[PDB]
Each structure stands twice: as C-alpha cells, then as structure tokens.
Nucleic acid binder design. Sequence first.
DNA 1: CCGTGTGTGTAAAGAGTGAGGCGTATGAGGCTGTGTCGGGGCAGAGG
DNA 2: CTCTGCCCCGACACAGCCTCATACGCCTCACTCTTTACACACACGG
Lengths: 97, 179, 303, 52, 201, 215, 365, 88
Amino acid sequence: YQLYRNTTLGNSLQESLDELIQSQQITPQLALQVLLQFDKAINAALAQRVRNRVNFRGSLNTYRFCDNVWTFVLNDVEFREVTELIKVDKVKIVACD
Amino acid sequence: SGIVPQLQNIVSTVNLGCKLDLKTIALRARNAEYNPKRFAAVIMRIREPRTTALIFSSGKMVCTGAKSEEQSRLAARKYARVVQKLGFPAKFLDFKIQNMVGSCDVKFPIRLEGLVLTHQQFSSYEPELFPGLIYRMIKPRIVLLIFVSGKVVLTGAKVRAEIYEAFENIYPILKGFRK
Amino acid sequence: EDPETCLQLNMVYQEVIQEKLAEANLLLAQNREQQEELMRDLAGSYMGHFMKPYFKDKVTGVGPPANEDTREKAAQGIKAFEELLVTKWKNWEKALLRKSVVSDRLQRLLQPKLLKLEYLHQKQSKVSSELERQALEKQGREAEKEIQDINQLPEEALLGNRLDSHDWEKISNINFEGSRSAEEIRKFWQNSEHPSINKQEWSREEEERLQAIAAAHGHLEWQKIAEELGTSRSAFQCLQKFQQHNKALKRKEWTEEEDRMLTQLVQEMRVGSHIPYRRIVYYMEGRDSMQLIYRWTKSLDPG
Amino acid sequence: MLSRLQELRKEEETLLRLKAALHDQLNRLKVEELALQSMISSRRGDEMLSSH
Amino acid sequence: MMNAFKEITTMADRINLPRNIVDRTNNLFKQVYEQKSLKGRANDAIASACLYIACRQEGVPRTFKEICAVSRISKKEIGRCFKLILKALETSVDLITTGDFMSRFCSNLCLPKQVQMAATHIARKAVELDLVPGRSPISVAAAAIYMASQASAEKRTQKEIGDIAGVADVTIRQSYRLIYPRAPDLFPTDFKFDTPVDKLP
Amino acid sequence: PGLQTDCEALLSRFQETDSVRFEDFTELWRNMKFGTIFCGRMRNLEKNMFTKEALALAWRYFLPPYTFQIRVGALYLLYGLYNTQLCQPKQKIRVALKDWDEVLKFQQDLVNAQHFDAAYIFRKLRLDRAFHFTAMPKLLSYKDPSDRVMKLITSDVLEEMLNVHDHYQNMKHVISVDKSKPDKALSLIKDDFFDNIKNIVLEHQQWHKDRKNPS
Amino acid sequence: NFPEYELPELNTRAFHVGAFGELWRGRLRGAGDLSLREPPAADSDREDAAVARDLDCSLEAAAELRAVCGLDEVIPENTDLVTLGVRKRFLEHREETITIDRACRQETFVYEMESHAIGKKPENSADMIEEGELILSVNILYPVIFHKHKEHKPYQTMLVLGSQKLTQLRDSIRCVSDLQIGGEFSNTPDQAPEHISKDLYKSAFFYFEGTFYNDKRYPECRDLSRTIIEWSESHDRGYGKFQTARMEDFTFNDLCIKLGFPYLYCHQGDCEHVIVITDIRLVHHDDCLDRTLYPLLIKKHWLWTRKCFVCKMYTARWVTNNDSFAPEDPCFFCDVCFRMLHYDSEGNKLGEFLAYPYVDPGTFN
Amino acid sequence: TVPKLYRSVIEDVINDVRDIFLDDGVDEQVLMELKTLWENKLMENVVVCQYDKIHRSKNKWKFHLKDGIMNLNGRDYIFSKAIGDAEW
DNA sequence: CCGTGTGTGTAAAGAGTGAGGCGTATGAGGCTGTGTCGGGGCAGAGG
DNA sequence: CTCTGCCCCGACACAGCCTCATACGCCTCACTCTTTACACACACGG
Ligand SMILES: [Zn+2]
Ligand SMILES: [Zn+2]
C-alpha cells in the first residue's frame, strides 16, 4: 500500500528487516512478502481495532493532491482525542485512497 | 439609478506558450489540484488575489475568482511566475478576459410573471426548474438572473461597460414591474 | 361670525381624533407584538443536549477538555457513572458472540495457510523451471488440502478451551455495534458463556458435594473448589449456588443492640410515613429488607 | 391555537380598516385646515388697507 | 426518425393523455428533427421535451417530474431539451399557473369536487395576495390541497400529496407555513366542513 | 380529569343570569353541588394536584381577555374552590407579577361600580393569604372573550362623534358671511363617516355570527 | 425587571431576582399581605369597620357582605358532574381490579418528601425569614447512573432561599460523586479508606447565563472554569463573553437568570448537573419558615440500588474489573462474597483483578 | 491504546508469517527473535491515514478522514475517524 | 401465637423499536471557458 | 438478422451570486411489552 510503512511501527519493521538481512540469514524476498503482509495486517487492524473519536481544528497552511494521495500541512492545530487535547504548532496529514 | 453592479467573478484566459507536464506541477506546486481520472488540468489556488487557475497540458491557463481585471491579471502573472519557477519556459501571451459576472440588488420585490409575460421574446421563466427569471439581453450579449427578492445577476459580459449598460437597460423595466 | 371659531373647533376635533388614533395605533402595536410572539412560537425550540456536554460545538459536537481535577480523579481510579454502567446479556447477544468467536477463529486459522498458498502461487508464477514447478504445485495441493481440513473443523474443537487468546476486540467491532467493550466480551466468553462451563441446572447430589467440599476445603478457595467439584463449573457459579443455599448468610435472630441500631437508623433516615428499608440495610450487618420490614412493623411499633 | 390566531387577525383587519377611514378623515380635515388658513389670510387682508 | 413516434405513443399511454396532445408532440418532434439544432441530444430526450411542450400548449400542463416519472431519462436533461427546443423553434409557451395542476392532482387523490374547488380558490387567492413570492406553483398547489384536505372531511397527510405532486414534504411544510396564518380568508365564503378551519396542524 | 367543561358550564350558567351578586353564585353552587367536586376517596398527593389544577383553571379564567361577567364568575369560583378544600395545607392560587396590576385595576373597577360583593370576596381572598406570589403562573421546565372593537367604538363614542358633527354643521351654517349658502372653500365635510363605521362594525358582527354558527 | 416569556411556554427573559423581589415587596408594601403568622364577636365589628373603610360602604353594608359571603369528607357521591362521574367510574374500576388498595411506596415517598417540612416552626425564634424572601424552587438534574436516565431525566427539587450566599446550595446538593473513594484496594481490602472525594476535590462552579461563579472558598479549590474559558478563547466556539466570579460574594437575589432555562453546576472535576429555576415565589406562611435547614430537598428520584452479583440479598460494597472469576467486567460484590472469593485463608490476592470500593448511588442519593 | 494495538499487530504478523518461515526453510527461532527485536526496536508531526471525504467549502475545508495514525509531539496516537475543520 | 412462604400494586428501569423536527448539505439553473473520454446515430459488410 | 469502427458530439469542474427545491442524518420523543424493584399484605400449617 506504500502508506503505512512510514510511522514508528513501519520504520521499526524496515530497520529490523534491514538488520536481519545484513546478518545473512534471511533473503530479501521473505522480507518483502513480510512487508506486504504487514501492510495488509495493519490495514485490517487499524481499520478494525479502533474506536476513539478525535476532532481537529486549525488553519490549513497548504494542501496537495496527486495520484490519489492528499497531502495537507496545517499550522496551529489542536487535536481532540477522548477527553484530552493535544496542541501542535505544525502537522502534516498524508492520506491515500 | 445610482446603484451599479459590483463584480463577483472574472474569468480570463492566457497562453503560457509551452507544453506542461501536469504531474510535475502537481508534485511540486504548493496548492495544486490534480486528479487525472477526474479532470485533465491542474487547479492551483492562491490567497493574495483569491483566485483559482486551471492549467492545461497545452499551456493555456484559465483564471477565475478575481473581482476586477487588475487582480485577475496580477493573479495570472503570479501563476505564470510560479510555473516558471518549476522549470518550465512559461510566458504571458494572449491574456483575455472571457467572462465578467456581477451581482446587484434593486431593493424592491419584482413581479416575474408580468415581466416574462410582456418580455417573452427575451426572458425565459421556469419556476419548476429555476425560481429565477432568465432575461437574454440582446444589445449586449448578457444574461440576467432576476429573482423576486430583487437580486439581479449579470453574466456573460466580456467588459465592465457591458455589465453597466445591461443593468441600466434592465433597471427601467424592473422599476415598471415593481411589486 | 369669524373663522377663528372654526379654527379652534377644528383644532379640538383634530385633537380628539388624534387621541383616537393614538389608542388605536397602540392596539395595533400590541396586536403585531402578539403576532410576532406567535411567529417566534412557531420558530421556537432543549434539555438533553445539556446533560454531559453542557457546552458542545455547533460544528463537531464535543465538550470541553478534561480539567486538572478530572485528570487527577481519573488517575486515582475513580470511575465515572458510565464506567460503572452494567447491562444484562441478552440471548441474541450470546448467540452472536458464539458465532462471532467461531468466525474469528476460522479467519485466524485460515490466514496463515491462505498466505502460504498465495506465496506458493507467486513462486510458481516466476520459477523459470518445470520440475520445481511441479514440486510447487504438489505443495500447493497440500496447502489446499490443509485449508479444506481447517474449513471442515468441528465447532467443538474450533471454539477453544476458554483460555486461548482470541481477538475479542474484533467481536466488539463488526458483530457488536460498540455497545460492549472488548474486556467485557472476553471476560463473559471466558468465564460464563464458553461451552466448557456447565450451565445445566444443579442436581441435589452436586449441591451436596459442593457443600461438603466448601465445608472441608474451606469457603475461601473457590477456584480449587470448582476444580475439585469434578463437573466443569466456574468458581463464580459454585459460590453463587452456595450462597443461595447458605444458611449463615443472614443472622435470622434479633438482639437488643441490633434493635437499638435499627431504631436509630430508622429515626435518622425517616422522611415521614415512608421508611426506605433497602437504604437502611446498607448499615445493617447480614440483614435483608424483608427482615427489617417485619421487625419494624411487628416488634418496634407501638400498637 | 389557531382560533385565537384568526380572532386576532380579524381584529387586526378591523382596526386597519378603522385606521384607514380615520386617516382619510384626517387628510381631508387637514385639507380643510389649509383652506381655512388661506381664506382667513385673504379675509384679514381686507381690513389692513387702513392702518397706522 | 422512426421508433420515436412509437416512443411518444408509449410515453402518452402511461399518462392516458388524449391523442391530440400526441399528434402535437409528433409534429413538434418533426419540426425539431428538421431544424437539427440539438442533434447531439438523444432522441428520447427530444421526444420527452416535445411531449412536455405539447402538454403545456393545450392548457393541461404537467410537471417535469411527471414526464420523468414515465420517461427513462432524468429531469435535468428533460429541462435542457425543453429549453433547447424552445430556443430552436422560436416558439412560446404560456406560463404555468397554479389553476392547471389541481384538476389532476385532486383527481389522483380521492378528494371530492368541493375540496377541489376549495383548494383552487385557496391557491389562487394566495398567489394574488403575494403570500408565496417566487415559489414554484406546484408547491403552492400542494400546500393548498393540504389545507383543503385537512379542513375537509377527507384528510390527507403530507406524504400522499408529495407523492402525487412530486414535491418533497419539506417543501410542502415550508409553503404551508408561509400561507399558514392566512388560511381562513383563502377558503371560499360558502364552504362546509366537519373540522373547523380555525384549527389546523 | 376533564374538569374544565364543568367549570365552563358553571360560568355559562352564571353569565346567563346577567347578575354580579355573589348570592346567585351561592344558589348555583348549592344546586349543582359544586362543593362536592372535591368529595370522594382520593389520596393526598393527587388531591393537592387536583386542587392545584382547579385553582389554576379558575385563576386563568379570572384573567383577561374574558368578559367582566365571566371574570367575576371566575373570581367567585376561585373563592368557593379555595374555601372548600380537603387538603390540610390549603393550596394557594399562583399569581404572577405581570397580572397583579391588571387584577388590582379589576378590583378598583369592581369597587367603583358598586359591585361590593366581588370586591369583598377579593379582599377576603387577600386577607386569608390564599395567593402564592410566583414569577410565572406555572412551573417552567424543559369561549366569551373581549374584542378590541368595543374598546374602539361603542354607543357613547358614536353619540359624541355625531354630536360634534352636528355642532360642526351648525357652526358652518353660521360662519358664512351670507346665510343663504356656506362658502365654497369649506364644503368637503362627509356624512358617510358614521355610515362607513356602521358598515364596518356590522360586517364584523356578521362575520362573528356566521363563524360561531357551525357549517 | 418584569419576568416575561422568551419562548411561548418554555422560557422567560433574563431578569434580576433582586429587582423582581423589590417589585413584589413594593406592590405589597404595608398591605397586611406579607405576614408569615399563624391564622388567628368583638372582632366582627372591627372586621366590618375595615371592610367599610376599604370598600367605601356603610357598616350595615359590611355586615351584610360578611353574612352573605360566608363559607358555603363524605365518600359517597351522587348527582355526579362530568369530572365527578369520571372519578366515580375510576374508583369503581380500581375497586373491581385492585385487592389491597393501599398507598404504594412511590406515592407515599413523593408525598412525604414534598410535605416533609411544611409549617415546621423554628426552635430558635432567631432564624426568622423576612417578610418576602424569594424562595427559588430550583431543580438539580440527577447524574446519569443508569442508561435509561437519558430517556427520562430524573431531578431533585430544592426550595432555596433568596438572599442566601452561593455555596449554601452547593454544600447542600447531595450527590454520590462526593462520596467516592479513590485508589485500588485489590492487594488488600483492609486499607484505611482514603478521604472521600468531597475532601480531596473541594472545587466546583455554577454557570448561570454566561457567568462562572467558581467555588474558590478553600485553598484546595482551583478555578474549574479556567479550562473552559481558555478552551473558549482559542477559536470561535459559539460561546463568547464568558464572565467569572468568586461564588462567595453573590446571593441568589443578585443572580440575573431565566426561568426554565438550562444552567450548569459542575463539581468533582467533571460531574455536571443541570440547574433549572422552575419558578420564583415569595415565601408563604404555610411552608417552612426556618433558615438552618430550609435548603432542604423537596423531591428526590429514589434511584435503584445495585446488589451483589453473587448473592442478591445485600447491596454492593466493592466493584471489580478484569476479574478472573466474575462473568462481567464491572462485577459488584458485598463484603462477604468479595472476601470469600478474592482471597485465601492466610490472606492474599487470588487470581488477577482490580477491586475498588463501590458506593451505591441508590443509598446516598 | 496504541501499545495494545501494536502488540496485536505484532502477534498477527508473526503468527501469519510463521507459515512462510516454516515453508521457505527458516526455523521458528528466527521468527521469535524477529518478534523480540520488533518490540525492542518499537521503544515532525506527521499523520498517515485514509480520507473518506475532503469537503471543500468556499475556503473552509471539512476533513472526514477514516482511520489513521498520527505522530504528534513524538507520541503516537490512533483514530478511527477524524471530522476536522480548517480555514485556508 | 409467633414463625415463614408466597402474593400484590405500582412506579421504575430495559430494550426495542419506531417516529419526527430541524439543521446541514446538495442540486438546479446560464455564464464563458478549456482537455478528454464515453457514446449515440451512422450506414456498412457479412453471413 | 448481427455486429462494428467512426467522427461529432455531452459531460466532468470551478469561479462567485441566489432562490427554491431535494435529500441525509442526527439527536431526541413515544410508547409498549416486559420485567424489576420495594413496600406491604395475606394466609398457613400443625
Ligand atoms: Zn454530581
Ligand atoms: Zn454477596
């Protein structure tokens, strides 16, 4: 899917696979099928493991759309997760449908 | 009367003079819109003049949203400069204003029924389709959307003088049909 | 004789008629105010919105963020009224939970073999060989046979052993509409709803065995009591049956100190002819509302 | 509640008609007043021909 | 050129409209096919627009939704082709008045003739009194019929009127509230009813 | 439930007498046994609720825009209901601030017109402290009316209009320098004002009667 | 200002309660109408003279008015009217369908709760309420303890007294949230009970028409409204021009509020109750005349009482979560069953679970 | 809630790649050490997510995002949806 | 003659749906304009 | 009888107004059988 392999979790996946392949005990194929099935599993769970409502307000600084991927950059944003507030100076939202 | 329309939209076109790769502009522009499965142009939005520019691969850009011709031209030049900074040989050739749409209020309710009855050859009033009367002015090729609340929208004009003359031509008729 | 009399008479006539208009226009203003009141009644409109979210956005519908006092209260493990909200398990909910667990286990067992078959097919697509391709085809046939065997797995061996890690949170997502949390569903399935828990009506011999085991091994290790009972029962069920058939649960005999305490509680907590006994029983040790009712009506009221 | 609405609206029309009639009365009364002013000016002008 | 006159006859059959309207529709189709100022438009849309124009001319106009309810195309293209045909033929069609749509709307409903006349008077006196400025005559007719039914012996709630006239119940509510306070004076002076006109929903 | 009708009947049977004396209300009360409206086995809670409802109904009938006769009948009904209550803590009539001035002026009119019976009843209701001086008539959570025409036009009003008109005509006749004819500058006076107002008022009366007559 | 309707029959205009009381007392100034005294041939003459003076009539006229205007149970009822006939039919149906015909618990509860203190004379003779004190029949919405509270919102009515400083009602509103005990007693249930939530979190605030009256009386109290106002100042929120106060320098008379309009009362962090002023009336002589206990409860909802899930004989003392024995997650036990199930002989936490003290909302509220 | 989500994802991924690990010829010890290194390595604000409806008003953007992950202030949060508002 | 074992009244939950008002969002309209992709007659072999 | 390529179209924005008409949905109300709870009562048996 090439979207969710960028967070802390996906970065950990990539780094662990890199360390394992550099140790000469797995093949790059097994690594890439593992990555693909990780993408599938995170897509399934992330859309099926969660219900916490959030609502964010801010001043949209910039936005972009290409090849079915939206890229927004917002400034002075506040995210409202369940009974708690997170204030961030700048946030980037990357969506892919 | 002493009231004159205030322009709400101005649509203009210009030829950049060189073919463009819309994918590169979408990937490098700050506020571009590009959905090739949805449309065949890149829609770029800016804040200073509050205008939207549709740029086509052939190099022809269409700017809309400007409230007067000066701002339309400035926005078109801004878009041309932005495209130039992206590594394209874009110029400013054949800048033309294609439409000038304005709104106004005569400040009195109007009887649309009688207006269309006495001006059938020009006006077309279909309440089921549109609750506004559509008067096809003939001296300047301008279309008038007249509503019972008094709001009158002038559209299809190429220059501001056309808008003013069309409103001055239609105002006496509306006054004669004052509700 | 002179119009001056006409002037003054017309002045007074205009004055009286203008007073008439003053009264009439005040009536008109009152009537139009009444009409405006009626229109706003037609345009009028509530309490429910202001129950938890007294302040709610006109855009999103969310309340103000947690305060420092609220965060401190949550840190101390003090439950909000919603957390302590308990709802009964309906029969349709139980059947849905069973079917959902079956489906979840089926999916979990199928996913590995399904991905193995997909990998075998992908390798077959680019193998650049024939004998290796036939070997891969044989492996794919074996994988398909394993998938078929998994699909035809019976429900008894599929459910589990009431202690295996299911993805219960899934049960709260697709099958349930979010009304039940994952923890609630998993506890209900593991402790009560699993077929490995004997829900059949208790027998007299089973009750006698339970009582004997509780008396001997003690009434304070009910897990080992359920294990030793022989029949597949939960400690909760055994304790429930013991208590419902116990005789030391209630004192069943009144004392002078208990009578004084009951009288003091009643006199303190009365509001007139109404005596809420369930609320009195809270401070009463080992008593039921019926016993308090009987004692206060028969032996603690002058007649 | 529409019964009260119709009673109120009919009273409203009643008092509007009364106001219209009386406003015609005042307009014609003021026309008469202006006529009186003009006539009294003209008449009082007939004895100002002999003054100190 | 063929398969459209058959289509026009089928279109008319579903409405049970007299044959003269069908002949006028066929003639209009012939003229527009001679002009070919709208060649790109589908033949079915042209036929539907011609049918609507013919119905309007004879004095028994229908609504675009009742031509779409029988046709295989959406109201949008019906209106587009209507305007295109009006422009191409350099012809004119009289404005639709509320008086046209009660003789049919009340006929589909089971209301008596007395309620028909009552609703007609209500809608008319509403339109001259400017109580419904710049609103579609169909919605005004629906509201008048709603008043006539609620006040009369036979009561119809908003859903039936919306389905018959093809007007959203919210539009009926708005057009009824707008003329709501002036209900009594709109009724005929000599009008019998079992529910007082002084109380209504 | 459905007590309103009964009260209405009483009010009707009072206004049909065209009398203001409290004695007539007393015979009506005795004949209809209205005092037994509270009689009957019924517990304290619903008893006080029913008394509250009856008192509120009587009080709202006592306030405008009801006729003077109906208002006096409602006052007598209030007195009888409050004085005949089976609740030990007699329920009190809820009186709002916006209505206190109107009730005071009604009492002033009653005493001025020598209707000492109703005035004494109202004074007694004040003395025994039967009024809860609330902010609004009801707890907030979540006929024979009077028309404006009589206040506008009546017998004395039109009588003095026509007297002024006749005096105006006489003074027109005497003002003119010549007794033969009045001046041509002052001939606009209308005689249809009385006719016009009569037509308008009779139109209203006709509408009212054809309204209250069922179809 | 005069109390007048904003909504047809749903809400009034914002007006000063003090001005309302001043208007009422001035319109009833020295009329013999504000007494607060118990109801009491020689007096007949004085009454006749007073009637003559007030009504401008003769002494004989006063005497005959007194005589004619004189006052003018038995379960049997005949010659029934409409309402009386309906009542007779209802009693007949009840007699033919009911067998005990005794006052049900709810009705007696409501009656004795409303009439708990009516005409109760004070003992000190020094806490007199002045002649006209603007008693407010406020109501506090019960917090949602059961899921069905949303369908029907329960409330408790309180006859507050005018001119009483705020924090007099806040200290009187009885809510179970103030008796909650924090901490986890899973390891051992014999720990010294932690100070109830009433002590740890003394902060609370009222909100009446855009004004946050905060309970800053005690040092442990913090500005609860601060968050909200800050969260309102960040962006356009549909709420603007928030005010603040101290809640100790204000009285109910000073409040400028509407009747029947939702207002807020927050306490214990986020426990929110809806304050609605049903009506404001001058104190009569037939109601409670005290001040020490006048801020009492006129009505309470009588919430349900949770019971131990093991045995339904007793109420709930402990609430367990993530229990290895209980079927449900939030399982309610009494002391007996909780000790019997969650511990061993020598004393140790058997299994895995989180047990906390549970105060029954149906007992302290 | 994020740590439990991550643990569940780890469990699922390792469990359903066990079959590939067995088939291709790598022992399960490699699988479990992969797991352990995965949790061990687990310990700019960017939101990677899915968009359900990016509504554009005249200048107000109403963002109806579906489920997604955010990396705010160095702390990872998860949402099922995001109905946000912004002004350009 | 004082125990208990079931009955009863009637408001209070519990889901269990089912309805309804209103707020918001959307469409429809000419406007003039630019790429492009489906597609609706069109006769035309081809059997 | 049955496809079948082919040039001449319609339809996507999105620019800003403007009124009416249409549709979605979302929170809250209704009520209704069905239990649910708590006080009180009536036997009940030797
Ligand atoms: Zn509380
Ligand atoms: Zn227990």
